[PDB]
Design a protein around this ligand. Structure first.
Ligand SMILES: CN1CCn2c1nc1c(Br)c(Br)c(Br)c(Br)c12
Ligand SMILES: CN1CCn2c1nc1c(Br)c(Br)c(Br)c(Br)c12
Ligand SMILES: [Cl-]
Ligand SMILES: [Cl-]
Ligand SMILES: [Cl-]
Ligand SMILES: [Cl-]
Ligand code: NA
Ligand code: NA
Lengths: 326, 326
């Protein structure tokens, strides 16, 4: 019966109203206070626009949601409210909806972002230490607040590179951690999904976000994005297996008494570990340091219980200059 | 050319006067302000007394030093002055000497200590987490201040168990860390000496104190003190080898291009690792937890560069309740 190694009793000790998001009653704001200026994204669950707050002429981000069940949207709203003001967490400013159709919109603070596909090739060795340190502040914060993000990936990390400012966004897949609870494993996006999700281990915890972080981080230092590129969920486990090796996978499956579907087992096969250094090449040589490698190594562990916690990660010597700069 | 992974440039960036202890001029205090009340210890370098400050009737500790070279005592005095007021560091209150013979005495804040041989059998599982957390505060502090203690052991950790207060004492073997400097390896006390000292690796750093901490910690959780019990310095390496295994030793000697004296090599022999769990027994079963073991495991590494830093150690999930209690 797997449990988190840290922050396990956070929601135990909070008032029930903190985590009982189904008992929330949304305080709808005024749809007219916010005007759409330009569309900047679309997704299965929404369309996203740059907008303005008419009252104060401030930019904002407006997420127009496609039809969504009451229970699902209250969970997202409650978690945003719970974390609002925390280190590098996106700020939810307002919640509104169209009177005729009841379509709800979520209103957030604006971030002058640069898509990671354009931004990450320009980051220096020091820059990556700095921004990952900023993203860990957000993860240590939401875990300490009893919440798992469950969709860490570059697409959900907004960065203003001029201001060197970062925000962790899109809390739609997030959940409250409760010891022993069995969660849906269809969360995160495929390339960032932890082995627990791929082998149907349902009683996972905050440590899933550290796997996802490690996937993102490996992509950045090796300039290979996504680092683990599977075509479907079976294939995702196979690509991991081919890097970490199947010896470590077998140990893991045995520890948690998991049995792989016969089909998956056949696809996974048998593989030796590929040492991190073998991913180094002329395209990433300026970023692959022994300290970067040691930190990555401690994130990308099959066993979720073995991974660095966010708190531990922040103290790794890889970030020592970021801390000194303070 | 081994270097510290953290705090390597602390003395580089400080004014020279911080670390140039030879340039200190002692400001002798008044020998008469302090009266010896009772002797509480003796050692190769001094005799120690409980005393009183006559002016304010406060207890103090008075260390009467045996004859000592000027350079050696200035180093101890400067380091005490540099660290005074830091988390759980003993406070040096005054420095005085006898007019007729020039014998110097060091005057410290008093601690109502209980010798570890009497105190540690009464510590609970939680108590050990708590006091080791307090000792790590001191080590992270002095390392951050550019200083290695080089004699961590229970005898130099004063604890008032009633007040739950800890102080790290006896800075006589301590030194300033300077990148690339070659230090004397005759420091620490035998049972707490790191493999670097035992194989004559001279360019060691703060990480030596983490080996010593791990020795102390293993003694506490397993109730086997000292944990590594060698009769002489060769035998000390052999007892370690017989626990950590010689495979890890060979890797280590090869990494730092060290060659063992032929005699030592013969005594060391060839040995498999003895897993931590094999030290568990009915005498320590109430203290040996998987988290305690994971933390120990990460301290007691041949390679000084692999060991947890004090900063990292403080964030380990083993201490999570101590942190929550705050
Ligand atoms: C896909 N695009 C690009 C910029 N940007 C996008 N989606 C965003 C969301 Br959702 C939020 Br919330 C914020 Br804040 C920003 Br900025 C966003
Ligand atoms: C051996 N004994 C027992 C108590 N105690 C001993 N040596 C001490 C030193 Br040196 C200091 Br400095 C302090 Br503070 C205390 Br308390 C000391
Ligand atoms: Cl979407
Ligand atoms: Cl580095
Ligand atoms: Cl002594
Ligand atoms: Cl525990
Ligand atoms: Na968002
Ligand atoms: Na002392």
């Amino acid at each position: 019966m797997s449990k988190a190694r840290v922050y396990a009793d956070v929601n135990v000790l909070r008032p029930k109203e903190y985590w009982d998001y189904e008992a929330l009653t949304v305080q709808w704001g005024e749809q007219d206070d916010y005007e759409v200026v330009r569309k900047v994204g679309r997704g299965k669950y929404s369309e996203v626009f740059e907008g303005i707050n008419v009252n104060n002429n401030e930019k904002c981000i407006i997420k127009i949601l496609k039809p969504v069940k009451k229970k699902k949207i209250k969970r997202e709203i409650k978690i945003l409210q719970n974390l609002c003001g925390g280190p590098n967490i996106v700020k939810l400013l307002d919640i509104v909806r169209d009177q005729h159709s009841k379509t709800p919109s979520l209103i957030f603070e604006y971030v002058n972002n640069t898509d990671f596909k354009v931004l990450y090739p320009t980051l220096t060795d020091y820059d990556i230490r700095y921004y990952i340190y900023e993203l860990l502040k957000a993860l240590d914060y939401c875990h300490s607040q009893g919440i798992m993000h469950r969709d860490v990936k570059p697409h959900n990390v907004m960065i203003d590179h001029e201001l060197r400012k970062l925000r962790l966004i899109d809390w739609g897949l997030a959940e409250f951690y409760h010891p022993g609870k069995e969660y849906n494993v269809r969360v995160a996006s495929r390339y960032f999904k932890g082995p627990e999700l791929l082998v149907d281990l349902q009683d996972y915890d905050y440590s899933l976000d550290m796997w996802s972080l490690g996937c993102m981080f490996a992509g950045m230092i090796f300039r290979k994005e996504p680092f683990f590129y599977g075509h479907d969920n079976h294939d995702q486990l196979v690509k991991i297996a081919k890097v970490l090796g199947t010896d470590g996978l077998n140990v893991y499956l045995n520890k948690y008494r998991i049995e792989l579907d016969p089909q998956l087992e056949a696809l996974v096969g048998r593989h030796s570990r590929k040492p991190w250094l073998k991913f180094m090449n002329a395209d990433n040589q300026h970023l692959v340091s022994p300290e970067a490698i040691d930190f990555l190594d401690k994130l990308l562990r099959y066993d979720h219980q073995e991974r660095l916690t966010a708190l531990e990660a922040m103290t790794h010597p890889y970030f020592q200059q970021v801390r000194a700069a303070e």
